[PDB]
Subunit: 461 residues, 3 copies
Amino acid sequence: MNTPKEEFQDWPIVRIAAHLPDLIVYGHFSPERPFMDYFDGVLMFVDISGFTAMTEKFSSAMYMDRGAEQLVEILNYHISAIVEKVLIFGGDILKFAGDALLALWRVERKQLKNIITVVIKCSLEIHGLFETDIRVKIGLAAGHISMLVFGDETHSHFLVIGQAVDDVRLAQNMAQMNDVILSPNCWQLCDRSMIEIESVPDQRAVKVNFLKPPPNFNFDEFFTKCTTFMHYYPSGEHKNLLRLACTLKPDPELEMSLQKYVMESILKQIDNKQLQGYLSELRPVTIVFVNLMFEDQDKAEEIGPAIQDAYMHITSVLKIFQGQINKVFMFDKGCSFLCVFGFPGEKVPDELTHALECAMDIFDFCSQVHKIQTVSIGVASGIVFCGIVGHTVRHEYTVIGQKVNLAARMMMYYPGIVTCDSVTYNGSNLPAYFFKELPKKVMKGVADSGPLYQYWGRTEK
Amino acid sequence: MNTPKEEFQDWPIVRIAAHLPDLIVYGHFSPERPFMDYFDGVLMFVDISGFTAMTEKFSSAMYMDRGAEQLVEILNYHISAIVEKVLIFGGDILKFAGDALLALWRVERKQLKNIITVVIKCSLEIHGLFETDIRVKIGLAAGHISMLVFGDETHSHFLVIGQAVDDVRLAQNMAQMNDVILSPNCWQLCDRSMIEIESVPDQRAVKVNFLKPPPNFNFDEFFTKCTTFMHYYPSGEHKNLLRLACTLKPDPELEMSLQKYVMESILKQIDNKQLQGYLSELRPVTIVFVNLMFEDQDKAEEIGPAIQDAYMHITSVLKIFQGQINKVFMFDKGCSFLCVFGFPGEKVPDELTHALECAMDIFDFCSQVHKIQTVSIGVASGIVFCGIVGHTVRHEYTVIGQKVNLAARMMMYYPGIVTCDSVTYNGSNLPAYFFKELPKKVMKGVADSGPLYQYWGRTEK
Amino acid sequence: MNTPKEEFQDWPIVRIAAHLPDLIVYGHFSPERPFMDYFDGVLMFVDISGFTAMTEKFSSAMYMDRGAEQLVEILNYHISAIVEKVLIFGGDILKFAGDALLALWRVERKQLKNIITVVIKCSLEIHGLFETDIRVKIGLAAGHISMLVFGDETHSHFLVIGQAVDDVRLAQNMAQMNDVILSPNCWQLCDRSMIEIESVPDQRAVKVNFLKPPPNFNFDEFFTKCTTFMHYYPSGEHKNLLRLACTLKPDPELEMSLQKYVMESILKQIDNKQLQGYLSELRPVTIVFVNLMFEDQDKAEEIGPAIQDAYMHITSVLKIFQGQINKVFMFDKGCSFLCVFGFPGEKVPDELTHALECAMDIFDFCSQVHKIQTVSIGVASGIVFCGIVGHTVRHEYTVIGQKVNLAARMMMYYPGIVTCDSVTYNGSNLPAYFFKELPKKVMKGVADSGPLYQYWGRTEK
């Protein structure tokens, strides 16, 4: 009697799970919104802005109308290598953005010390991929972490929150290229016998100079011991897979839950109802970047309902014009929604006027939400790269480009108001007294932004 | 000198062969119609109505417009497991329907006894897949079997005919969930030392309680002996494949013959000229279910020409409105054609009026065909699931849904007339005196059908 | 720590490299046009006109509208087997046409003798594939070879030039089916102890009767020695691949260079922005076959600038009507451009008039190019097969059909003028005095061509 080799792991549920971390795939939590949970872990923030800054080169006519295709190819080649390292070291990739990937090792508190060593080693091997002009910067943090899941009956989003999340970003912003920077708490919790550090000026974070373990240390055996505490590390019959999630079987109630995190156009591709290459494009869009600041952004029990309330209103406003939420994340200050008008063939006429009117609606509503202290919205319009970025087994749809960066910086450097770039102002054709021409500010990563404006709105008020 | 590994087995001919049983793939018979052949074998009928009854759940708004995709996924997950069992036990899957899969072990007469044991074991292992609310019922039969191939210059269809075919359906209809029921002849021909049975009330068919072989029996060695009589069991270099048909090489005359069994839209997908997911859908259609009853439905030499003659007329009528024949099979009573109006983007306006006019044309013509004793036609209109169901290596396009079941039951419970449901009656807008409102009958598997009608037609007559 | 198996070799750059020989893939040469280089090698010309002559059979209604699909399938089945032989024997497939594939073993001069033995053996094993009514003819040549790369900023083409290139075609034209014919120089350079030949009447080329090596010869060990001189033979970790090019990694500057050789519609498929089967079709087109004859067609330093100058003008003329250059090659006499009007959904109205006007423009301009001695252009219109022909790892878009052959023969048998077939003449509706009805000539491979015409043009002149 024959025993043919198992073949099928390419079901829709598996394809959906590529777009999500294990935190959600295996999370099994209530469908109640907001949902909050609390745990401990180590975070790795990998700054990949050296890679994503290539968007402007691939906009050149030298690329003969295949810029987007060539960009996604080269970006995924490099980003895949990072993803593989993270996954083989037992991490969970939580999110990708144009500037960063964020990864988590969730563990019981007693094991943080040893897991930090694993994550340091992983970080050093990531840097080793790129020795020899593209490099990364790594921030590490550890401690208490909160998770928030928000959404409605058809859409779900998650965030991780708290001081360790704030810390990993602060650590990464301190790093130079090639550096691994530990948060103050990470340094407090780590195994100091493993590593040599130096101080970072005006900072309690430290830089890892060397991982130099004791004479009898064996990293492979140490790692094996550490896998005891990694719930989903592929093992046994499945030790050849990068993710347990590659083994997921059809389960309609699970797929119902998971698909709510994924854009409809991505699901269309997953269902083989759209060509696999259709979402890789350089296309004109309008970015609406919404930042919500809170009295204390580390307390999920306070900021969770506020985010949910804001999200309900944002989604209703975006619905009217097929705007989408591409990403949500915590910045140093606040919770940010990266909204896009124009992307998977969702491109309405008057995209500009509508974008500004939607921004103002969002600003007005969110300003009155309990516990939201300041709302700031940046609106920028131009060509951006759109595509699924990452590895075959772990990837996400992402938007990358100067105008994304510009809208992000506008909302931080012009807090408390709705701002727009020159493309948006000029194109709207709305009367000029609906705007105010703003002072020019020098902004991180932004080379001449052009004139910027406040959207003051219809009335003098 | 290198020896790279063979790679390509994904030719169009291979893809076509997935939709067909070995009976046809390796059949090499005349292109003359009708064609009849005669042999012996064991039949397995697996009632999968417990699975296909899920259509109505996947029509829920909870499935967010991916009902069809989720349905096909979960159905193929389970049906694939059944298919694998059948194929590894050396069976030939002949046909899939919404309610059933039918499999054949063709063997010389002397080997029926031992092959029945193999098929009993297979049946028990199928039941074992599902221990722990979805289960199957299995009927087995054995004896003489006739094959009929009918069609024209561009399309071919086949059927298996005779008392063993009638028997496997009767056996399956007796079964409860989890049962394996043997036809009277199957029980007469089997190895009684292998099994313990019990009587089925008011029946000469039996239920298998246990397969309990003699103390020195070894099933793997027994099975190996039995493979001597299985012409196409994958073996040798190909013992890792589920089907020999996976090794078919390009052969234009063979492909010409095989493609005649497959719908044009399926061939479009096979030729990579249509997206692989385009045929999975919940779509409104009109089902026209035609039943032809004969004096003796076991005599292929009589019923074959009659079916051919009916088919020629059916196909001409369906052509005018892009109706398709989705399936043909033998019921307990008669030969049934499952016709569909609306499916692979074949969706004409006035689908209802035309469906009724086509049904009446078919009824009138077939009623005058020699040897056709009674014609009955059921017409029902609504949302049905359409998709390729089965395993990667053996699958068929199938239509599943309440309205398919309803049209099937109408043609059996209202014999000798053309009947239609309320959707069809109301929608046609044809004058009401073209119909007769019928008495309500309680029908198998049908919960309130709504008012039913006879299509009396244009004249009082 | 797990070590999952490398997976991804299916990047766009890899897919692009399938359409190109190693001569270009690993060529790294200047982007300056024309570019010429010089080397030595052995050439194999495999006449596959016995296969491509099947186009007319697959135009039959028996093929039910899947002629193109069935043709490409059967052609690629057989052509793949030839490709594999060539590649495992260490050859570089340079180009495919309807009539032939051309392969190269580039080696230092000292190794030509041993490489000829390898190529003879390869040729004999190719013939052995087909023992038992479809066969091939093989011509071999050896000696000095020149390469020319020409094009503009967006498109590149290459050719190999010189007496060995002229010779391999002459050798192939002498061969009967099943023959291996060596050029005079090939016979002069070969290891005569390995083979028995016979004279070819009225020719200094020879026919290989037998490869019969000395008693102690071992071909596998001989071949291993010969791989020392084969730069890109897959080896080591990659000895299971048919081409090193399967291992190419993303490299934007390399991909920029390579994509210039590939048609935009092919790149669309490569980028998963078009269905993989969309380019296999039987479609009406107009072939414009341009032949340029030179005083000496073996001197790249003379004919290179002339070809470049002609190409610049051809491309500008074709641009206006989305005509494409499908292939360029050296014939016995001259450099030929196979141009096509109508193919990857590039199908303009008045295709005929425009084709004739473009031909005349080309003729007039090229006639005045320095060093071009005679220009001849054949214009023929009808159904032709279009598709990607070859192996998964090495294939090219190709056009095949009677009208391609007819346009090719018209340009050779009616030199110095623009000629057209009856379809083109009749269809153009241009006044009849723009043409001259020509004498009928009996042409190779052409069975009744119908009336042929010269396009004299608008004025008596």
